[PDB]
Amino acid sequence: MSSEEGKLFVGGLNFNTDEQALEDHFSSFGPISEVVVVKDRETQRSRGFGFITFTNPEHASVAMRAMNGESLDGRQIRVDHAGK
């Protein structure tokens, strides 16, 4: 992305993954500018893919560093930094 968005790409999201679930855990790892999660509109259950925006690429970098392929809600997710 080459931008100060700090957006990370999370894959394999847990079914019980939400904007708050992702924001809370990723917040702990680093600042969260914004959070977005793709889920079922009829089941309201995460589909295994979501987007998370950080304050700065540096913050985005820490989260993927501490979460890439790491058990999120008991299910490993892959955080590929959109920007960094």
XYZ file of N, CA, C and O in Angstrom:
336
model
N 0.857 -1.221 0.000
C 0.000 0.000 0.000
C 0.878 1.251 0.000
O 0.530 2.255 -0.628
N 2.011 1.184 0.708
C 2.933 2.317 0.787
C 2.195 3.564 1.293
O 2.297 4.653 0.712
N 1.448 3.385 2.384
C 0.682 4.478 2.976
C 0.688 4.374 4.497
O 1.023 3.326 5.057
N 0.324 5.476 5.154
C 0.291 5.528 6.620
C -0.990 4.898 7.203
O -1.315 5.128 8.372
N -1.711 4.124 6.387
C -2.954 3.487 6.817
C -2.716 2.466 7.927
O -3.529 2.348 8.844
N -1.617 1.715 7.820
C -1.298 0.683 8.808
C -2.277 -0.499 8.708
O -2.479 -1.240 9.670
N -2.895 -0.659 7.535
C -3.869 -1.726 7.325
C -3.203 -3.086 7.153
O -2.295 -3.254 6.340
N -3.707 -4.052 7.923
C -3.220 -5.422 7.868
C -4.321 -6.316 7.305
O -5.507 -6.042 7.506
N -3.925 -7.385 6.611
C -4.898 -8.319 6.033
C -4.931 -9.604 6.863
O -3.962 -10.356 6.871
N -6.047 -9.847 7.558
C -6.166 -11.049 8.396
C -6.969 -12.120 7.658
O -8.090 -11.865 7.206
N -6.386 -13.317 7.553
C -7.041 -14.437 6.880
C -7.262 -15.595 7.842
O -6.597 -15.686 8.878
N -8.210 -16.468 7.497
C -8.536 -17.616 8.337
C -9.166 -17.161 9.653
O -8.943 -17.782 10.696
N -9.933 -16.065 9.600
C -10.569 -15.523 10.798
C -11.503 -16.527 11.466
O -12.246 -17.254 10.805
N -11.455 -16.541 12.800
C -12.299 -17.432 13.584
C -13.754 -17.053 13.370
O -14.057 -15.893 13.093
N -14.640 -18.038 13.483
C -16.069 -17.809 13.279
C -16.596 -16.759 14.252
O -17.451 -15.946 13.888
N -16.083 -16.776 15.486
C -16.508 -15.813 16.504
C -15.637 -14.545 16.469
O -15.475 -13.860 17.484
N -15.094 -14.236 15.286
C -14.260 -13.055 15.094
C -15.141 -11.881 14.709
O -15.970 -11.985 13.801
N -14.948 -10.769 15.409
C -15.716 -9.567 15.150
C -14.807 -8.362 15.141
O -13.621 -8.476 15.439
N -15.370 -7.209 14.801
C -14.594 -5.978 14.769
C -14.027 -5.709 16.155
O -12.879 -5.304 16.294
N -14.844 -5.969 17.172
C -14.431 -5.792 18.555
C -13.432 -6.863 18.978
O -12.473 -6.565 19.694
N -13.663 -8.111 18.544
C -12.765 -9.206 18.905
C -11.389 -8.943 18.324
O -10.373 -9.047 19.020
N -11.376 -8.574 17.045
C -10.119 -8.260 16.361
C -9.498 -6.976 16.895
O -8.290 -6.920 17.126
N -10.326 -5.951 17.085
C -9.841 -4.672 17.586
C -9.214 -4.839 18.970
O -8.169 -4.265 19.237
N -9.871 -5.602 19.844
C -9.373 -5.799 21.209
C -8.003 -6.490 21.243
O -7.080 -6.002 21.903
N -7.879 -7.632 20.554
C -6.616 -8.384 20.549
C -5.495 -7.622 19.837
O -4.361 -7.566 20.326
N -5.821 -7.036 18.689
C -4.840 -6.281 17.912
C -4.490 -4.967 18.620
O -3.361 -4.495 18.512
N -5.449 -4.407 19.377
C -5.206 -3.181 20.142
C -4.122 -3.451 21.161
O -3.220 -2.636 21.367
N -4.228 -4.623 21.788
C -3.270 -5.040 22.783
C -1.877 -5.108 22.169
O -0.901 -4.666 22.783
N -1.796 -5.655 20.951
C -0.513 -5.762 20.253
C -0.021 -4.388 19.782
O 1.184 -4.120 19.803
N -0.956 -3.523 19.360
C -0.599 -2.180 18.885
C -1.847 -1.311 18.601
O -2.955 -1.833 18.564
N -1.688 0.001 18.391
C -2.841 0.938 18.106
C -3.728 0.490 16.938
O -3.226 0.013 15.927
N -5.048 0.684 17.079
C -6.001 0.327 16.013
C -6.749 1.569 15.516
O -7.621 2.091 16.216
N -6.432 2.008 14.292
C -7.116 3.156 13.701
C -8.586 2.811 13.448
O -9.486 3.557 13.844
N -8.813 1.661 12.798
C -10.168 1.188 12.501
C -10.182 -0.330 12.393
O -9.126 -0.956 12.370
N -11.381 -0.913 12.338
C -11.512 -2.365 12.230
C -12.764 -2.742 11.422
O -13.831 -2.147 11.576
N -12.595 -3.734 10.553
C -13.674 -4.224 9.695
C -13.581 -5.753 9.576
O -12.500 -6.286 9.344
N -14.706 -6.451 9.740
C -14.713 -7.921 9.647
C -15.814 -8.387 8.695
O -16.960 -7.937 8.794
N -15.460 -9.309 7.800
C -16.429 -9.859 6.856
C -17.045 -11.111 7.483
O -16.334 -12.060 7.824
N -18.364 -11.085 7.646
C -19.093 -12.200 8.250
C -20.379 -12.473 7.480
O -20.730 -11.734 6.558
N -21.074 -13.534 7.879
C -22.318 -13.917 7.255
C -23.393 -12.898 7.610
O -23.495 -12.499 8.754
N -24.180 -12.475 6.634
C -25.247 -11.498 6.890
C -26.516 -12.192 7.411
O -27.411 -11.534 7.946
N -26.577 -13.521 7.261
C -27.723 -14.303 7.727
C -27.386 -15.045 9.022
O -28.279 -15.352 9.814
N -26.091 -15.323 9.233
C -25.636 -16.020 10.434
C -24.844 -15.073 11.346
O -24.626 -15.373 12.522
N -24.396 -13.946 10.786
C -23.601 -12.974 11.530
C -22.356 -13.665 12.100
O -21.866 -13.333 13.182
N -21.866 -14.638 11.329
C -20.693 -15.417 11.684
C -19.557 -15.124 10.714
O -19.719 -15.193 9.498
N -18.408 -14.803 11.286
C -17.209 -14.481 10.513
C -16.974 -15.510 9.416
O -17.215 -16.705 9.598
N -16.536 -15.008 8.272
C -16.292 -15.851 7.093
C -14.826 -16.267 6.939
O -14.488 -16.968 5.980
N -13.962 -15.843 7.865
C -12.539 -16.196 7.791
C -11.694 -15.108 7.125
O -10.524 -15.338 6.826
N -12.278 -13.930 6.903
C -11.548 -12.824 6.287
C -12.019 -11.498 6.860
O -13.219 -11.291 7.050
N -11.070 -10.608 7.149
C -11.391 -9.309 7.711
C -10.255 -8.316 7.475
O -9.125 -8.711 7.183
N -10.567 -7.030 7.624
C -9.581 -5.964 7.448
C -9.452 -5.172 8.748
O -10.448 -4.906 9.409
N -8.226 -4.809 9.107
C -7.974 -4.056 10.334
C -7.013 -2.900 10.032
O -5.965 -3.109 9.414
N -7.394 -1.679 10.433
C -6.568 -0.501 10.159
C -5.866 -0.007 11.425
O -6.487 0.145 12.473
N -4.562 0.228 11.296
C -3.735 0.709 12.405
C -3.493 2.200 12.327
O -3.676 2.824 11.282
N -3.059 2.751 13.455
C -2.756 4.166 13.546
C -1.657 4.505 12.543
O -1.787 5.449 11.760
N -0.587 3.710 12.574
C 0.537 3.906 11.660
C 1.128 2.554 11.205
O 1.037 1.572 11.943
N 1.731 2.478 10.018
C 2.345 1.212 9.495
C 3.196 0.502 10.535
O 3.264 -0.726 10.549
N 3.829 1.281 11.407
C 4.660 0.719 12.466
C 3.804 -0.116 13.413
O 4.221 -1.181 13.869
N 2.598 0.384 13.695
C 1.672 -0.296 14.581
C 1.132 -1.543 13.893
O 1.010 -2.607 14.509
N 0.860 -1.405 12.593
C 0.388 -2.520 11.789
C 1.449 -3.622 11.797
O 1.141 -4.809 11.915
N 2.712 -3.198 11.670
C 3.840 -4.125 11.643
C 3.924 -4.968 12.913
O 4.197 -6.170 12.837
N 3.723 -4.340 14.077
C 3.818 -5.068 15.350
C 2.743 -6.149 15.430
O 3.031 -7.274 15.851
N 1.496 -5.790 15.084
C 0.405 -6.744 15.192
C 0.658 -7.970 14.341
O 0.565 -9.084 14.851
N 1.001 -7.781 13.058
C 1.286 -8.946 12.210
C 2.487 -9.694 12.745
O 2.540 -10.911 12.655
N 3.442 -8.963 13.312
C 4.630 -9.588 13.866
C 4.228 -10.530 14.999
O 4.759 -11.640 15.112
N 3.310 -10.061 15.849
C 2.860 -10.846 17.000
C 1.638 -11.735 16.709
O 1.223 -12.486 17.599
N 1.027 -11.632 15.513
C -0.185 -12.431 15.221
C -0.086 -13.299 13.951
O -0.867 -14.239 13.809
N 0.840 -13.001 13.032
C 0.957 -13.797 11.792
C 1.000 -15.298 12.072
O 1.968 -15.825 12.620
N -0.076 -15.980 11.673
C -0.189 -17.416 11.856
C -0.377 -17.779 13.333
O 0.042 -18.853 13.767
N -0.966 -16.856 14.101
C -1.159 -17.060 15.544
C -2.630 -17.223 15.921
O -3.515 -16.561 15.383
N -2.845 -18.139 16.860
C -4.165 -18.479 17.364
C -4.941 -17.271 17.860
O -4.731 -16.783 18.973
N -5.897 -16.860 17.040
C -6.802 -15.779 17.387
C -8.124 -16.448 17.731
O -8.711 -17.130 16.884
N -8.560 -16.301 18.979
C -9.787 -16.952 19.436
C -9.663 -18.479 19.255
O -10.654 -19.174 19.014
N -8.428 -18.989 19.402
C -8.155 -20.426 19.283
C -8.010 -20.907 17.837
O -8.011 -22.117 17.591
N -7.872 -19.976 16.892
C -7.707 -20.339 15.484
C -6.660 -19.432 14.867
O -6.821 -18.210 14.876
N -5.582 -20.028 14.355
C -4.507 -19.235 13.781
C -4.976 -18.452 12.565
O -5.654 -18.978 11.682
N -4.581 -17.184 12.547
C -4.913 -16.271 11.458
C -3.644 -15.706 10.884
O -2.666 -15.552 11.603
N -3.669 -15.403 9.590
C -2.493 -14.865 8.918
C -2.664 -13.386 8.667
O -3.584 -12.968 7.958
N -1.783 -12.601 9.274
C -1.840 -11.154 9.144
C -0.783 -10.688 8.138
O 0.406 -10.628 8.456
N -1.241 -10.340 6.930
C -0.363 -9.855 5.877
C -0.554 -8.364 5.764
O -1.628 -7.899 5.373
N 0.468 -7.621 6.157
C 0.381 -6.173 6.163
C 0.101 -5.577 4.798
O 0.906 -5.686 3.872
N -1.056 -4.914 4.705
C -1.453 -4.250 3.469
C -0.468 -3.127 3.135
O -0.126 -2.919 1.970
N -0.030 -2.398 4.174
C 0.903 -1.282 3.995
C 2.269 -1.553 4.630
O 3.200 -1.988 3.946
N 2.390 -1.267 5.935
C 3.655 -1.451 6.664
C 4.723 -0.516 6.091
O 5.667 -0.220 6.804
